[PDB]
Design a protein around this nucleic acid. Structure first.
Lengths: 115, 153, 57
RNA sequence: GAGGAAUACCGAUGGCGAAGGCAGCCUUCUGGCAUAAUACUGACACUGAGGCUCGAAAGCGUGGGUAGCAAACAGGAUUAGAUACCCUGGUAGUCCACGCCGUAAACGAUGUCUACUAGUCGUUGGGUCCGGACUUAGUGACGCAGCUAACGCAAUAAGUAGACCGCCUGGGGAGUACGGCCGCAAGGUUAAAACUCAAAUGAAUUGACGGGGGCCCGCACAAGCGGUGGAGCAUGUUGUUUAAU
């Protein structure tokens, strides 16, 4: 159906969400580290992102996407491992980009944890 | 230890086959410093399977079963700031043979055959095709190695 | 921080180039400062402590 | 699409302000400072009890606003308990206008103003010379003499002197009571006594310790082999019993 698409690699310290959409912003498939059998400490690992991108990428590979540009966001560890999965799955990358929300000293952050 | 790497000892090969692999396996069956008692157990077990499977040379057969038991990935215990990560790592070759030789003897000691030479013969035959506690133990280690497959530290 | 992969280029090389561009832009430096609110008094100590450290070396 | 708050980078022992404080950008009103030269007044100066003014945050009054964060509060955990730390929410407050409050480790724990006393290296705003050199007013890092119990200070003195003001007189009781004054209130300010004890303190020294750091060793752990802990008996002890055990 669609050949050009976008890969979103929204990755946090706890979980990484890898949804891949079209050029417009309509989601086609999505996978998560916590929805792949990994929970707790193993969910926040780069490998759990490697399988999440592998599952999501293969899920919409049937759609017809071959050209896709990733949009990584977040400080998580699966921001680097997930992109490697798409490259090894047969995807032809268009551009690697990092659109992370950086406030210009806006809303106040939560208080520092005393751990 | 803590500083050096002491050199490993030299082991004389078995008198009936001239192989250091069987002689090392005799060491794994022996208890109470009774070399001869373990030798007839190993020789009897090897003769039983050799006489049953019609194989002239059983040293190569023991290699086949040993390679079918040796694990390739083991799950080590690691600590990172109080957190325990059960990292799966490779097994050094000297430890591969030791683990396989250990599991065979310990799995054969809980069999139901009449004699220990017969008990060991059953496990060697069973592990040859890929069954028995020895194979089950190797899968259990590999199952735990695949269970994590996420700590590469 | 946008790296346009060129023709005939293994993603392994491309991702290395992307990681370098993100490091240059200070992407992860800013997201780490936003994890918690640093009190202005603590900011002044941290900045000055770095200032003293910088001058000594 | 609505709305509120803060203004990433620049950003800097950088700058401005008497202190408190003050960061997107633009306009308007407005204070002080820095700088070369000339002209002018001609000691008009410094300090300053009372007094007055300003004065972080929190808090209070009235009226608005309210996104994020978050006292209180609610729940989930951890725990012996957990009215906490951690997690999910969350109201006052935080924001605005006008007023109170007048307190902070409001600190450089160092009152203000003068003059003099080796030097070295930065940096901000000027200035004058020939990329440098010099000279100013700040802001720093060192380092002599000198000072200091020591730490350390050292032209931005804690040195050498002078002017005036403030304050201290063992530790608790106590910055508490009482009485004034101030405040809407919270409270603030001024400020004792009885009684009690021979100490309480500062800096540095040697150890010891740290759920501080760094390095290293030992069957210390790890990797293994064999045990003890369960049975019967031997032996020793406890206990109990005994005339004594």
């Amino acid at each position: 159906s669609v050949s050009e698409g976008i890969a979103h690699i929204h990755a946090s310290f706890n979980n990484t969400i890898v949804t891949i959409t079209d050029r417009q912003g309509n989601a086609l498939a999505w996978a998560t580290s916590g929805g792949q059998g990994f929970r707790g400490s193993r969910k926040s690992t780069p490998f759990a992102a490697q399988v999440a991108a592998e599952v999501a990428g293969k899920a919409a590979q049937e759609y017809g996407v071959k050209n896709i540009d990733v949009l990584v966001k977040g400080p998580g560890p699966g921001r680097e491992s997930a992109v490697r999965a798409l490259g090894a799955l047969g995807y032809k990358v268009n551009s690697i980009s990092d659109v992370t929300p950086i406030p210009h000293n806006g809303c106040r952050a939560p208080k520092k944890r005393r751990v | 230890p803590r500083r050096r790497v002491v050199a490993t000892r030299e082991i004389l090969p078995d008198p009936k086959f001239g192989s250091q692999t069987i002689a090392k396996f005799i060491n794994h069956v022996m208890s109470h410093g009774k070399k001869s008692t373990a030798e007839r157990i190993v020789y009897g077990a090897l003769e039983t399977v050799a006489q049953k499977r019609n194989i002239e040379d059983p040293v190569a057969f023991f290699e086949d079963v040993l390679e079918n038991v040796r694990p390739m990935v083991e799950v080590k215990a690691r600590r990172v700031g109080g957190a325990t990560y059960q990292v799966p790592m490779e097994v050094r070759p000297s430890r591969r043979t030791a683990l396989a030789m250990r599991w065979l003897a310990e799995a054969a000691a809980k069999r139901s055959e009449k004699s220990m030479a017969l008990r060991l013969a059953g496990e060697l035959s069973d592990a040859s095709e890929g069954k028995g506690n020895a194979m089950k133990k190797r899968d259990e280690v590999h199952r735990m190695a695949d269970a994590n497959k996420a700590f590469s530290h | 921080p946008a790296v346009k992969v060129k023709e005939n280029e293994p993603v392994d090389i491309a991702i290395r180039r992307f990681k370098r561009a993100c490091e240059k832009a200070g992407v992860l430096s800013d997201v780490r400062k936003r994890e918690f609110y640093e009190k202005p008094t603590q900011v002044r100590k941290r900045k000055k402590a770095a200032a003293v450290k910088r001058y000594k070396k």
